[PDB]
Design a protein around this ligand. Structure first.
Ligand SMILES: [Fe+3]
Ligand SMILES: [Fe+3]
Ligand SMILES: [Fe+3]
Ligand SMILES: [Fe+3]
Ligand SMILES: [Fe+3]
Ligand SMILES: [Fe+3]
Ligand code: NI
Ligand code: NI
Ligand code: NI
Ligand code: NI
Ligand code: NI
Ligand code: NI
Ligand code: NI
Ligand code: NI
Ligand code: NI
Ligand code: NI
Ligand code: NI
Ligand code: NI
Lengths: 169, 169, 169, 169, 169, 169
């Protein structure tokens, strides 16, 4: 029996382990996009840098959940990380739309995890989710929505995509 | 046809893609070990920090290969990342032995990739492998060998493991 | 008999002298392009500056080979430098494509020289070629490939060429 | 018709193009001398450095004429650069005498170009020639004359050549 | 069985041990020359300092091989160090010629060791030899060749030897 | 006849030459011990560093005697340096005991040389020996005696040897 565990439901512990995998998956997707935009035949360095930083953030989200698991006396169980769904991501706009949709799926999963935590009356976990995850997700979704509108205004192809990429760099 | 590709054999391009997966796998293994050592019932912070840094290094190795692929005009193909073989890694010594064995497998794979590059007379790739990979691997293997000898001298269990962990921290 | 000469094959010495001429030729080509882009009826200062720096680099490559020749106890034999193939280089894009093709020819010549050095078991020369020439050539080819993709995105004519030129300046 | 061209005679434009080739030729001669003096069996580092700097100056003279051509709305036409007349330049004194004679030929060519510019009543070109070329040539000829006298006093062979070379370094 | 040893052939391990002895031998030779030039009846302090530094370098070369042996999991076996072939080294020129010949023998031995490493497909050892030994040897041989030419110009006896010695100091 | 030689007996000159060899021998022994402790299966970095510094000191002792020989107008005669008696030195304690015994043999040899110098009424040599050698030897013997007592208290094996090694580092 873990000496620190208190008011930590096994359903919460399992859902966190599933969420760690999702965060690692998203890290991997953004890493693929990052290097997709450094191909000699794409050469969008601003987009590359945006997705590299996003990739790093997602791995930090995974690590914060892993640390959270250990703090509550849960046990981390790591699974395989699926390959990204694409190898090639299209235009800058198509990648930002893909990222918008991923960020929303992650948000949905975090809200499901918040409801699991509430149903088990775990206010420490609901607080973690509100302060460190749900707020970041909403800011990110808004940021990516702004970027999509801006790229569609400026481009979304050709000189406009070239200009927008520099504001990202 | 990629505009930059010159003297880059498809066998070299495939072996690099396989090596990227191996590096990502090793990153994942060390990440698991890192958080294993932050469990309340393990609490070896020096070991945790050693494996966190190792995890980061392996992801950098993967990224350098991805960048290398793009520089030569190859195309990155990402696959799934297997789960680490264990969820729990035992003693500090058992983890260092596991890491020693992983580092040697990676070294073997890099030497196989060097032989593929030589057989296809690609001196740019053999040089990359010698300067950025094979040297690091030998230094790492020696470093981990030293650590194992030192932990077996000091411990490898109890107060000795507690003392050795602080030299890692 | 040169007092320093050791394990230096005359075929290697001749191929270096031919490579010095090629490097000087490329310097001259880029010098022509540089001043082509300072014509009152072209006025692409970013392109001018890119080709001026390229011209300087190529003369440095020639000088490093000349110094290398003297270090091994070979003897420098200088030939005439052909006129550039054009007097006028067209658009920024046409010049970058010409430079991409030149850089690849030079790369091919360096790889031939590496094979001559290997066949004569001269590891000092293969090392020179790998560290100081072949790596630079691959980075340059990738850089120019990126620039071409970027100019085709932004332009390649008109306002896009005007914008791209400023990122070069 | 070039939008900037005013009072610029085609004979002046052709003579400038011929003068650019001469300057590039002299650069090449001094570059050969420079590396001749870094041979293991010559080892006169002061002379090497003097001729390297001279080589650089001549390429700057060529570039100033190229820029001048573009400013007046002439068009640069580049020809082949002949090989230096020697591969080996003898003693330090023999090289300085060769350089003295080259500098005087260049001076003669510049004075011919000044007379062409005067005959066509181009005071902008006569001014360029007087301020940026003819003065430099006279100072250079005097400097090289001084050096020859000094080397003949000190040496011109043996310990004297060894001492003089250090005042050049 | 050494825990770190991987792809390290016993022939390579033996040749390294022989090379350590050669490096220590050369250190000893240069140490003898160094103090030979501090004799009251020789008093060439620049030569003394050159050979003292050379002596130190050779001991560093030996130490780098010893460290290399341990890194690969080989075992250092030290033998006796022969006495220098002379007790008295003659003129500064005779010592520089002796050093030139020693440096070339060492270079030959290193090239033999490179061929042993290649024949056993050890790219880590070939890389060590190319980056840390063969390049240094070629620069040293060229440097000593330059010095010999310079001393023969200035002297090689009497006032010229006295002047050259100060450029060494 | 050496112009500086005064009151310098040939027996003193020979004994100094023998003492130079002994000092070089001890340097070599400590160099072997130093790298013995950097083996992957020993990994006692504090001991390595202690013996590396000791090795350096002994070579300085040899050099001070060589310089002394030249100052008095004696002539340095260098002999072969025997291989160290072992290739492997055992435990840290066994090496410190070996070093204690070597330091005492050297001390005995220096005292014999002091008696030779006194018997020949050479107060300059007795002074050298007292100020620069005999005092250092006594401090070293005391230091090594202290270390042995301390290692036997702390260890001399296992965690104690691991702790003591850090006070050496
Ligand atoms: Fe996330
Ligand atoms: Fe790795
Ligand atoms: Fe080049
Ligand atoms: Fe000029
Ligand atoms: Fe050496
Ligand atoms: Fe001593
Ligand atoms: Ni973000
Ligand atoms: Ni599409
Ligand atoms: Ni590491
Ligand atoms: Ni177990
Ligand atoms: Ni470049
Ligand atoms: Ni055209
Ligand atoms: Ni000048
Ligand atoms: Ni002549
Ligand atoms: Ni040296
Ligand atoms: Ni002689
Ligand atoms: Ni000491
Ligand atoms: Ni024993």
């Amino acid at each position: 029996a873990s000496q620190v565990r208190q008011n930590y439901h096994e359903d919460c512990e399992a859902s966190i382990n599933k969420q760690i995998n999702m965060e690692l998956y998203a890290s991997y997707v953004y890493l693929s996009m990052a290097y997709y935009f450094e191909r000699d035949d794409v050469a969008l360095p601003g987009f590359a840098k945006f997705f590299k930083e996003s990739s790093d953030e997602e791995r930090e989200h995974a690590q914060t959940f892993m640390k959270y698991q250990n703090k509550r006396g849960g046990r981390i169980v790591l699974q395989q990380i699926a390959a990204p769904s694409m190898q090639e991501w299209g235009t800058g706009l198509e990648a930002l739309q893909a990222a918008l949709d991923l960020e929303k799926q992650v948000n949905q999963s975090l809200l499901e995890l918040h409801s699991t935590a509430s149903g088990n009356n775990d206010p420490h976990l609901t607080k973690l989710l509100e302060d460190e995850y749900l707020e970041e997700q909403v800011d990110s979704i808004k940021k990516i929505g702004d970027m999509i509108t801006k790229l569609k205004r400026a481009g979304p192809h050709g000189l406009g995509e070239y200009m927008f990429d520099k504001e990202l760099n």
